[PDB]
């Protein structure tokens, strides 16, 4: 049986306050700028649209330096960092952001027609953007997030896949990575294995993967250390509504219709697929800047971070804001020349992550031992190389960051102001 | 007279958890995908705006296997589940869906129009699609759900019926059945003996019946086992407005207008219709993955789960979201080619059912007896074959999901923390 | 789409005759077949969409004709039973090229096949 | 079912010279018209689709006209490669039927 970590796990009265100076991202907003003949990436993707995933560090509180040790017995115990309090700043204008392909499949506009449309040539994708879907989330726990989108599945040992043939589907479990995409509003898919065609979505998700994060299998997690605390935020309308060019990959059972005859006598395809939109973005509804109390998890591990490690998870479409910057080749010519001017495109991020840490004491007993070795075994090898190395993660260092003076920070004060003693 | 349940029915001290894996389903958005020579599904129809409706079968408290049985007297008494919490987990990411018809019967746009429009020739019918009316709702009783819906009514015998000739409606009380359609804005209707068009509406509901739950019905209902909590939730607005093809079948009574003359000699068709949109669609407003305490219901019933059954319908088009998946028909040329792929569509759901129950006693006196006999005979029989072959829904066996450790389960903390003791 | 150049049949019996298709993508286009004898014009058979079996038949050859297709060899084929001298003649396959309503020409025919009844 | 009347029957012409080919429906197919030429002993080849539309390889002096019953095949100054049989079908929808055919033949 799980038990609370209120069980085996007690809390001091130290507390200490952390932060990251101003975290800043910025690059490209669609995909990333590298040499041609290189590979090396000469300028990032750096979207509102994508994870942010921080993997917190902290000073072990066992090798840290406290002013006073006699609090507890360093014999039959040990201490654990707990989180209590956190506020993920967010510092650039609220705005929203925008995305397309040049070559997009959009065969015909569905929404109203006055005539039956013409016939799918060759090629009839048309250059268009859309407003995703407005997304808010934030997770943390002392585990990795762990995501759910649809891929492909193993085929059946039967009947050969003809090619062609529409692909298995099979939900995939994934661990959430920083610069991962999220849903955009054509849902949690691999939309590279699962769309040869190249051009059903904008080039920003185009070749990547959406994910959602698995919120049902983490809350069931048995421990709960994946995720003890979240905000969730999302809303989504249907902008335009559209037609897939292409052939016909299932044909329309003609029990559902009439035959048509001359124009009529083609059906058209009746792959429609909407456009979405975020609408749109206010202050009001702002998830950040705002400090959450992890008091009460609904998890068992309340908050504990073992192996002094910390997840922040976070996606904010609300200040996806691109802009474009354009510099001319030429300053002489007093006459307008779109050739004169490159236009490209850019896009800023803006953190500034700051936590309140609450120490805590294990007496190991035989069943603590028994428990936490069972749990998770590195818990107790590592008290008296990287797990997750295959993984990519914002790295945040916060180990020379503690400070006893909650009092010098703006999380510090409105902890104390919060918790009155 | 009939009487709370609270009346005959004592309330043990037992309270266990049980939950289903992960229901998952997948399949095409509007229609099932078979074998034309033959008849067998080989993908069935899965859309966000269909009924989800779970039969919920649990283990026989009598037949159970407790550690300690003092708690009560198999002699006079016998044993019964009640259930007093829910929670209907939902996980895709939060979208919209979109459907339409490549035949619809749409002549033109009367929202606004600059001239007089052309004339009716054979078959105007355009490829439309439109964004259904957005619907979450949640019903629960120990008996199927039951719904309405206006359907071909039988004709008195007199006047022959001219071919042609307007059908007669009646509201048609039916069982909810799982797989049903939900009204998507067009009403609650029998589209496949109401409209020989087969062009009124797009396909997904084009030869199906979109039934809604007649709440009037089921809470007369005197015993009120049907259903002993709900939640709705449902908005839609006018997104175009169109008109209909076709022959007047009855005409506009001339003193309500002053007769035309060249173009405007010849009346343009009055059979308009809108075009339905449920808005957008939002986190805040969500019904799911929220626990709900049956602990007093307005019925007589309070959520006992007669039978050792318990049924639990849903809809939800707050996760619609269709995703188009094309493969290549080759991997070669490096030039787009619409025949080259072939388009197409899925849809998947998810679902993940959590429940609280308590045990509960009947002492067998006369009286009891007689009126539980009374109430439904089968109680008393089945005590110390499926009545309902004839309909089907989705099949949850619970009879091994049991845990009187609801401690290890999210829904289980949260009924505690809730009950406190 | 190649054919086979004659089939000699017997009064009565049944001739299964073969199409197979090369040079393009054979699961996104139906197949269509047609009749022609050297008195008269041409002559719809059906036609017969491989990817899924979906068939559309001349009501003068529904019970006459049957259509099928090998997705993995990519070959159309099609039989007729009950033969007689009336059905002594050259039959096609050819391909319909479908794009969307307003885009198709069944453009490309195969060399034939003489069926003579004797 | 559907049927296509196809006239002339018959057509005799010289090089240089401009002929019609016409096409009558038996009820309304809209636009869906096909038109084929037939040389003597080959298969069939299509010239247009959508009662107007230009096929592969098609030179422009052919042109096909026409929506509803009446459609037409025009063949604007003939040439040698142009006489045969041409044939009319619908493609509507099933069953698909053809026109009886016009032989084109040179004049001497």
């Known amino acids: 049986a799980v038990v609370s970590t209120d069980e085996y796990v007690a809390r001091t009265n130290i507390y200490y306050h952390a932060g990251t100076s101003r975290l800043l991202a910025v690059g490209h907003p669609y995909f990333p700028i590298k040499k041609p003949n290189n590979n090396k990436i000469l300028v990032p993707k750096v979207s509102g649209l994508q994870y942010r995933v921080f993997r917190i560090h902290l000073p072990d509180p066992n090798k840290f330096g406290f002013p006073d040790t006699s609090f507890y017995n360093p014999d039959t115990q040990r201490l654990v960092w707990a989180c209590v309090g956190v506020e993920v700043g967010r510092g650039q204008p609220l705005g929203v952001g925008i995305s397309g392909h040049p070559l997009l499949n959009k065969l015909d506009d569905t929404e109203n027609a006055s005539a039956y449309a013409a016939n799918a040539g060759v090629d009839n994708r048309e250059c268009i953007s859309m407003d995703y879907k407005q997304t808010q989330l934030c997770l943390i726990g002392c585990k990795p997030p762990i995501g759910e989108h649809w891929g492909k599945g193993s085929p059946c040992t039967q009947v050969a896949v003809q090619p062609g043939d529409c692909p298995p589907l099979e939900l995939i479990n994934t661990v959430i990575q920083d610069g991962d995409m999220v849903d955009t509003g054509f849902g949690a898919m691999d939309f590279t294995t699962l769309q040869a065609n190249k051009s059903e979505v904008p080039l920003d998700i185009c070749t990547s993967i959406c994910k959602y994060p698995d919120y049902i299998k983490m809350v069931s997690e048995p421990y709960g250390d994946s995720l003890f605390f979240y905000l969730r935020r999302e809303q989504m309308f249907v902008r335009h509504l559209f037609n897939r060019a292409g052939t016909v990959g299932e044909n329309v059972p003609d029990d559902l219709y009439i035959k048509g005859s001359g124009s009529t006598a083609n059906l058209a395809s009746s792959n429609y697929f909407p456009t979405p939109s975020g609408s749109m973005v206010t202050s009001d509804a702002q998830i950040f800047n705002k400090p959450y109390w992890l008091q009460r998890a609904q998890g068992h591990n309340n908050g504990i971070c073992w192996g002094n490690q910390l997840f922040v998870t976070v996606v904010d479409t609300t200040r996806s804001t691109n802009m474009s910057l354009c510099a001319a080749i030429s300053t002489s010519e007093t006459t307008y020349k779109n050739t004169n001017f490159k236009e490209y495109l850019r896009h800023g991020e803006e953190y500034d992550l700051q936590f309140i840490f609450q120490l805590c004491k294990i007496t190991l007993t035989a069943d603590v031992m028994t428990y936490i070795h069972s749990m998770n075994s590195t818990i107790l090898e590592d008290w008296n190389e990287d797990p997750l190395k295959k993984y990519t993660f914002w790295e945040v260092n916060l180990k020379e960051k503690f400070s006893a003076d909650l009092d010098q920070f703006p999380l510090g004060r409105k902890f104390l102001l919060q918790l009155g003693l | 007279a009939v009487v709370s349940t609270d009346e005959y029915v004592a309330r043990t001290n037992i309270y266990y958890h049980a939950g289903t894996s992960r229901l998952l389903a997948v399949g095409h958005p509007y229609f099932p995908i078979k074998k034309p020579n033959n008849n067998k599904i080989l993908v069935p129809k899965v859309s966000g705006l269909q009924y989800r409706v779970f039969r919920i079968h649990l283990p026989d408290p009598n037949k159970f296997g407790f550690p300690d049985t003092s708690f009560y007297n198999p002699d006079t008494q016998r044993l019964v589940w009640a259930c007093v919490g829910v929670e209907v987990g939902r996980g895709q990411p939060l979208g919209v869906g979109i459907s339409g018809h490549p035949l619809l019967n749409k002549l033109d746009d009367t929202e606004n129009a600059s001239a007089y429009a052309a004339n009716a020739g054979v078959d105007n019918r355009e490829c439309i699609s439109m964004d259904y009316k957005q619907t979450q709702l949640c019903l629960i009783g120990c008996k199927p759900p039951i719904g309405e819906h206006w359907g071909k009514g039988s004709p008195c015998t007199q006047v022959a019926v001219q071919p042609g000739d307007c059908p007669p409606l009646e509201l048609i009380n039916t069982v909810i059945q799982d797989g049903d359609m939900v009204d998507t804005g067009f009403g609650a209707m029998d589209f496949t003996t109401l409209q020989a068009n087969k062009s009124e509406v797009p396909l997904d509901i084009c030869t199906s019946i979109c039934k809604y739950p007649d709440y009037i019905k089921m809470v007369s209902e005197p015993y009120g086992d049907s259903l002993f909590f709900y939640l709705r939730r449902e908005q839609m607005f006018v997104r175009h407005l169109f008109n209909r093809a076709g022959t007047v079948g009855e005409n506009v009574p001339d003193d309500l207008y002053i007769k035309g003359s060249g173009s405007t000699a010849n009346l343009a068709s009055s059979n308009y219709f809108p075009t339905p949109s449920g808005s957008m669609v939002t986190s805040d407003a969500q019904i799911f993955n929220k626990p709900y305490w049956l602990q007093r219901a307005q019925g007589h019933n309070n959520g006992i789960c007669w039978g050792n059954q318990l049924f639990v319908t849903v809809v939800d088009t707050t996760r619609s979201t269709n995703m188009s998946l094309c493969a290549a028909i080759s991997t070669s040329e490096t030039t787009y080619k619409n025949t080259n792929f072939k388009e197409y569509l899925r849809h998947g759901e998810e679902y993940d059912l959590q429940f609280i129950f308590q045990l509960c006693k009947i002492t067998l006196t006369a009286d009891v007896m007689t009126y539980i006999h009374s109430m439904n005979s089968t109680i008393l029989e089945d005590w110390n074959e499926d009545p309902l072959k004839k309909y089907t829904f989705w099949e949850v066996n619970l009879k091994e999901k049991f845990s009187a450790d609801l401690d290890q389960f999210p829904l289980g903390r949260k009924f505690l923390l809730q009950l406190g003791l | 789409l190649q054919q086979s150049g004659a089939e000699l049949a017997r009064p009565g019996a049944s001739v299964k005759l073969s199409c197979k298709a090369s040079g393009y993508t054979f699961i996104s286009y139906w197949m269509q077949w047609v009749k022609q004898r050297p008195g008269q014009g041409l002559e719809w058979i059906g036609a017969?969409?491989?990817?899924?079996?979906?068939?559309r038949y001349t009501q003068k050859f529904k019970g006459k004709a049957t259509l099928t297709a090998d997705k993995s060899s990519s070959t159309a084929y099609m039989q007729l039973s009950s033969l007689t001298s009336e059905d002594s003649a050259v039959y096609y396959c050819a391909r319909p090229s479908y794009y969307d309503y307003d885009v198709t020409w069944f453009a490309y025919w195969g060399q034939g096949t003489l069926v003579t009844v004797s | 079912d559907i049927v296509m009347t196809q006239t002339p029957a018959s057509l005799s012409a010289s090089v240089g010279e401009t002929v019609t080919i016409t096409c009558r429906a038996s009820e309304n197919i809209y636009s869906y018209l096909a038109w084929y030429q037939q040389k003597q002993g080959k298969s069939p080849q299509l010239l247009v689709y959508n009662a107007e539309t230009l096929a592969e390889g098609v030179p422009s002096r052919f042109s096909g006209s026409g929506s509803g019953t009446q459609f037409s095949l025009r063949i604007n100054s003939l040439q040698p490669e142009d006489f045969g049989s041409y044939y009319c079908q619908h493609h509507y929808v099933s069953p698909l039927t053809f026109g009886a055919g016009t032989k084109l033949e040179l004049k001497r």
């Open positions: 017969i969409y491989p990817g899924d079996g979906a068939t």
